[PDB]
């Protein structure tokens, strides 16, 4: 069998998240290690701070990579997945805490990676008004044509009737203020339109962040959002992961992956979010479950 290890993106951090992880063994102990990496406060970010401070691309992309990696690494010390095959793939952000799971990167890299990747996303915000707005529902074509009429990127790509538009704030809301037939436009909460070209200048600090950090091939079956297909080299998978910076997330051909494997079970890592769900939709059938506290990476064994 197969079971299917889901690293959120975000959208899924909240106030306090790491509180209930942090009482692990060596928990805090890493949390200070990675807090050194991508020198950020990590501990503070993940229990104190608050929901909106968290919110800043800069801070939550690390932090929520440094959740997914804690529950990993728990779940690596029970050794409860040690012996099952398993298949692995992230949105987002959580592609690099993908990496980490799937062996690519160490932890310590991935977080501090991720942090680079924040700052350097934050810094590009600035260059032009941007952002996103997910948009549900509506008739498929009619939607995504729309989008290309107003210079609009389908940045994410999740489900049938499930994509997040992204452009210049501009062109966002004169979608808002048309929206296709039955299609519900929502404006996301993020400071720029992430997984598009306007994140270009982020680019060369991601890239050279990347290219200095120490990489294996993967351990397991390693998806990318680029195009739901696996990466099977160190090199392919750092290089997809960079370019991911200006592509839109394809988590639709990723779960139609999932589907063609056996996957017999799914499990989302903290912060969970929506991807269990998501999931659930293709992969009919299989039982999902999401880890939010230390007391459920014991099912996952039986």
């Known amino acids: 069998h197969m079971i299917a290890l889901l690293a959120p993106g975000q959208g899924s951090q909240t106030e306090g998240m790491l509180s209930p992880w942090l009482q692990l063994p060596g928990a805090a102990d890493q949390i200070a290690a990675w807090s050194k990496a991508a020198d950020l406060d990590l501990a503070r970010l993940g229990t104190t701070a608050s929901t909106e401070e968290i919110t800043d691309t800069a801070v939550a992309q690390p932090l929520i990579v440094a959740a997914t990696l804690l529950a990993h690494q728990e779940l690596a010390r029970r050794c409860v997945l040690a012996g099952k095959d398993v298949i692995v793939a992230g949105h987002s952000v959580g592609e690099i805490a993908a990496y980490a799971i799937a062996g690519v990167i160490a932890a310590d890299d991935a977080v501090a990676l991720a942090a680079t990747r924040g700052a350097e996303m934050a810094k590009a915000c600035a260059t032009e008004p941007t952002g996103m707005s997910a948009v549900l529902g509506g008739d498929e074509t009619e939607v995504l044509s729309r989008l290309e009429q107003l210079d609009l990127v389908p940045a994410n790509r999740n489900a049938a009737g499930q994509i997040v538009a992204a452009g210049r704030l501009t062109a966002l809301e004169k979608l808002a203020e048309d929206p296709p037939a039955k299609a519900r436009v929502r404006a996301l909460g993020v400071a720029g339109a992430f997984h598009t070209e306007f994140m270009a200048p982020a680019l060369d600090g991601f890239a050279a ?7 294996a091939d993967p351990t397991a079956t390693l998806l990318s959002n ?10 392919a998978a750092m290089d997809t992961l960079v370019s991911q910076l200006t592509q839109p997330v394809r988590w639709d051909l990723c779960t139609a992956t999932l589907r063609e494997h056996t996957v017999t079970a799914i499990v989302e890592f903290p912060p969970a979010g929506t991807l269990s769900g998501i999931a659930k939709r293709e992969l009919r059938g299989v039982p999902a479950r999401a880890v939010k506290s230390p007391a459920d990476l014991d099912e996952l064994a039986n």
């Open 209 to 215: 962040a990347a290219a200095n950090i120490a990489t």
């Open 226 to 235: 680029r195009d739901g297909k696996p990466v099977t080299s160190a090199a």
